[PDB]
Design a protein around this ligand. Structure first.
Ligand SMILES: Cc1ncc(C[n+]2csc(CCOP(=O)(O)OP(=O)(O)O)c2C)c(N)n1
Ligand SMILES: Cc1ncc(C[n+]2csc(CCOP(=O)(O)OP(=O)(O)O)c2C)c(N)n1
Ligand SMILES: [Ca+2]
Ligand SMILES: [Ca+2]
Lengths: 613, 613
């Protein structure tokens, strides 16, 4: 009791020492940011948390999220102290030859989500906690450590409100209030009262502690939890480093070698005993979850010729897949009546998460829900508002996450709402995400098939859906695969291969009809996936059409279908590629009128074709 | 003043009627969202605000920002009531032939910033108010109307904290607490007390009012202001629409014709007088602002061969431009010691705005400050964290904003911090923004020239800067233009044109040096701007090097320099293009080690060249 209390202090001081050794050895890193959190980390990992020290990914463990990811050395140090990492490896921090990278990443068994972009951790932790309480109904708790500067990010406050709305009493945020950010004091500095007022206003039980008192930390964590709990820790940046504690201009500055030896000796001389604390194992009450392929319970049941918006087919398809597996969950940001995710909510309400008008958080929640393969999430909103969550999506890829995003209302074809609602840069954005597969389904059938494939594909999947009702053109037994395009109109005398998708596929087919009046035939190709792109079928089609390719897309010129095709085929002998896309910020009108205005309707397609001979 | 109160009530009801007529005529729009705000709008435009009804852009006017932009029809209605718009034009809402678009846009003289993507208005309002108080030091105030659903956006809370930090007592936010969002009730519904506590916690003076009482509204606006003021208005969605008021399932639903005629009749019967209120003009105390081009006080003074990181060159150039004109302002997100915007802070502290770790708000503040051409802002952070502000940037283009953004730490060349800090999708992101100019300066001189061009170029300018110290290669008298590239190495026997930028241009030049040992000459081209690209110089260069182009970039394959070049040259007869780029999520290491690992350093370039002949 007085032995355990002193061992915790000693642990904290060991954790300080290692943070210094590692960053001094690397020649870079953030020792003063680790040092403010040492007692916090000691009490968390060697008193409060319950986990298997030799099996960090174990589904019964408490979770820890290091939202202030630049303190990575003290996370590494705690897993050495726990006996998972070798103590010697700590010194290899930031090396090309080590997995102890500058910020945490999931190649590390003890890391679920990559942090590094500040303000994202608590949202991931909300996902884990929500999963904990409502999906696997287990006893595990979730702990998230944030900086004070980090609290200026709006994403943090979305996560705060989400936790209280959903009564995440299994969630604890620890706020490292060390007064300073990177380049100056944090706005609120040591005004602990205001931090408490903000947290309480957002529905949290907020406890102010001295963050360098292991006693106060233990009491705070020991209190009964009836709502999300915020431990607001008054600390000093660089605590325990003589001449550096509470000083400006030391963020991200490693101690030089000779100074570090002095500092380490002083901290070491504070250590009363070398005996290490063992981690306490968890209760093993998380259910088993089966990772098999998830199949639609039947073939699609559309009728060729019927009309359906791909956004509504997405909804029907998601709801349908939710009957095949318990693992499928749906999130939406107050647009469920526009994206048709409300269909899933109706049929499977327990597995619908209303995220409200908070796209950054919605994405983070999904990433959290997918950690340790507990669920298979589909998030939806207008594709335009996924731009609000680009940094979260980017970090999702760095976190090697398997999440599925469906963005509706793509392009100028939405009509009257105008450009604030029109997704015209979403192909560019999603194509630039390293682990991404981009589906652009043209049909209700192709939509159902995209949903099924996305659920079983590793990495980040985006499904681009559309507002207008278009014809079913595919038979229900049609076979779809990632990276396989479809030729949906062909003849022995095709003069151009026209590639379109979604609404521009249908405009291209209408253009074929107008052109058959003038005895001009065109081959029409639907990509299905924009990334990866079926290079082979595109090339074989071009060679059947005197090498001529025309691409037409409801998207800006940059980063879209046209550019994917061009870079796929550049330098092939005989091949020419011309483009139709949207050249400027649009405006309000009827869908058909905007497609004409922006040169991507049937008439524009026919007129481009005639210009190519 | 009892005649006045009744005239405000009559005005409120004229505004409902018009919202209904316009949306019913259009067949789309959001009349229930207009109706909750009718009294708020009446009191603002016909009692509280001071502005010139016949000159909405007048620099002495109070500003109004309609953050909940789907309420556009009631905005349009107040501007008809003030005599600026013809009343008959309101019925052309949303038509291809009208400028009364679905959401407000700056083609409307009464609109400064486009809204439509919720949660961004208050940030722009913050920038206007900051400008009002600290730059033009004028008497005008700034009023911003938000929805309650909209307050779930984290961007709103950044703006709130910013406004109290910077003592914006000339800023008033009105919160339309109408209980409901798009697809369900808003989380806090009518718990007015919690709204009050959240606002107060964030340093605002919060006044709860009945949002349908013109008297309570007038009282609230007339209170003394010593801090930013939040008028928290309890309202009912669809107020005054019998059978619809406070009901679910009516968001974005126009009344059908026969119902609209019955409702309008009932509202009209409440109106006692037809006599319109006149707008009160402002006190005209804003200073004049010069519109001239802003030139560097001298030519660059670098020395060929000296070594400087482009990130540092940026800080130096901005500070230098800051001596030429007091219109240049600098904003930074707690990274000023890393982007070198601290040099500007040091030299012109009155014109530096610390935005803290709130990248969304920073972009919105910049956009606000740039409205009505009052200032020329340059925002800075790491390029990777601009992905956090992508929607705000997307909306800035729709706002036709002239702002400048500088993103440091691009690529794998930052080294040890790892992928979370590495910008590898920023060229894609900024290329997809329709009004963008993308500068990628390769040395100190190019960076100084980019800063000067950016200040004077219309639209969104992005300047990508780098962490490594590379050699100055241009002399100080070199002339740069948007859209003009530079051949930095050539000879009469060049075998390939290699396009690099930033670190990859320097890697290409070093590759030239290895290769001349084997008697292989290459032509090295620095694009300067990636958008627009100097197509002509690229083709002319490729024609002198056997049609062969090799692109090398510290950026992912999609949407980068490689794809921009492929799409510019595809189908040209001479021409082949091969690409070197980053193929996957990176990891920690020394700069030179990551460049080698990802195949974009001198040796990879040299070898790619050998494989092309
Ligand atoms: C979204 C984002 N913006 C900016 C950065 C740059 N950055 C790295 S650490 C840091 C300061 C964080 O200060 P704080 O939250 O107080 O943490 P401390 O180091 O003091 O514990 C910043 C701004 C980042 N990593 N992520
Ligand atoms: C960032 C963003 N996400 C989603 C939307 C879709 N949307 C349009 S209006 C609306 C509901 C807004 O409700 P509220 O703020 O309560 O305004 P109200 O219409 O009730 O006055 C939504 C979700 C949007 N415009 N912007
Ligand atoms: Ca801090
Ligand atoms: Ca509302």
């Amino acid at each position: 009791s007085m032995q355990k209390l002193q061992a915790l202090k000693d642990t904290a001081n060991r954790l300080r020492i290692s943070s210094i050794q590692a960053t001094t050895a690397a020649g870079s890193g953030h020792p003063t940011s680790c040092c403010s959190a040492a007692e916090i980390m000691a009490v968390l990992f060697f008193h409060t948390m319950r986990y298997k020290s030799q099996d960090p990914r174990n589904p019964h463990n408490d979770r820890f999220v290091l939202s202030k990811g630049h303190a990575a050395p003290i996370l590494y140090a705690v897993w050495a102290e726990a006996g998972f990492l070798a103590e010697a490896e700590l010194l290899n921090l930031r090396k090309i030859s080590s997995d102890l990278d500058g910020h945490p990443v999931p190649k590390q068994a003890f890391t679920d989500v990559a942090t590094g972009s500040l303000g994202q951790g608590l949202g991931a932790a909300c996902g884990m906690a929500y999963t904990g309480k409502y999906f696997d109904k287990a006893s595990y708790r979730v702990y998230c450590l944030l900086g004070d500067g980090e609290l200026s990010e709006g994403s943090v406050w979305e996560a705060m409100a989400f936790a209280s709305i959903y009564k995440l009493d299994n969630l604890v945020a620890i706020l490292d209030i060390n007064r300073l950010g990177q380049s100056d004091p944090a706005p609120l500095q040591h005004q602990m009262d205001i931090y408490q007022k903000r947290c309480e206003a957002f529905g949290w039980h907020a406890i102010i502690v001295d963050g360098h008192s292991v006693e106060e930390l233990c009491k705070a964590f020991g209190q009964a939890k009836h709502q999300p709990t915020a431990i607001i820790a008054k600390t000093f940046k660089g605590r325990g480093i003589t001449g550096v504690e509470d000083k400006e201009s030391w963020h991200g500055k490693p101690l030089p070698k000779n100074m570090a030896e002095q500092i380490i000796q002083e901290i070491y001389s504070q250590i009363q005993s070398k005996k290490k604390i063992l981690a306490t194992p968890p209760q093993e009450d998380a259910p088993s979850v089966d990772i098999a392929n998830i199949r639609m319970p039947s073939l699609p049941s559309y009728k060729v010729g019927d009309k359906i918006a791909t956004r509504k087919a997405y909804g029907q398809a998601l709801a349908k897949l939710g009957h095949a597996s318990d693992r499928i969950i749906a999130l939406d940001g107050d647009t469920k009546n526009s994206t048709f995710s409300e269909i899933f909510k109706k049929e499977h309400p327990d597995r619908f998460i209303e995220c409200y008008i908070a796209e950054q958080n919605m994405v983070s929640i999904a990433v959290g829900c997918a950690t340790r393969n507990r669920t298979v999430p589909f998030c939806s909103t207008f594709a335009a508002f996924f731009t609000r969550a680009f940094d979260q999506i980017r970090m999702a890829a760095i976190s090697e996450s398997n999440i599925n995003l469906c963005g509706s209302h793509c392009g100028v074809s939405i009509g009257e709402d105008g450009p604030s609602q029109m997704a015209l840069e979403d192909l560019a954005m999603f194509r630039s995400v390293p682990t991404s597969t981009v589906f652009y389904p043209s049909d209700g059938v192709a939509t159902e098939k995209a949903v099924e494939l996305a659920a079983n594909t590793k990495g980040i999947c985006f499904i681009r859906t559309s507002r207008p009702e278009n014809a079913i053109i595919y038979n229900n037994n049609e076979d779809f695969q990632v990276g396989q395009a479809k030729v949906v109109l062909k003849s022995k005398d095709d003069q151009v291969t026209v590639i379109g998708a979604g609404v521009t596929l249908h405009e291209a087919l209408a253009a074929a009809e107008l052109l058959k009046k003038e005895k001009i035939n065109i081959r029409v190709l639907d990509p299905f996936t924009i990334k990866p792109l079926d290079r082979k079928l595109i090339l074989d089609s071009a060679r059947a059409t005197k090498g001529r390719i025309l691409t037409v897309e409801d998207h800006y010129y940059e980063g879209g279908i046209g550019e994917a095709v061009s870079s796929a085929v550049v330098g092939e002998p005989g091949i020419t590629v011309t483009h139709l896309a949207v050249n400027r910020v649009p405006r309000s009108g009827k869908p058909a009128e905007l497609l004409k205005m922006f040169g991507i309707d049937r008439d524009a397609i026919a007129q481009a074709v005639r210009g190519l001979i």
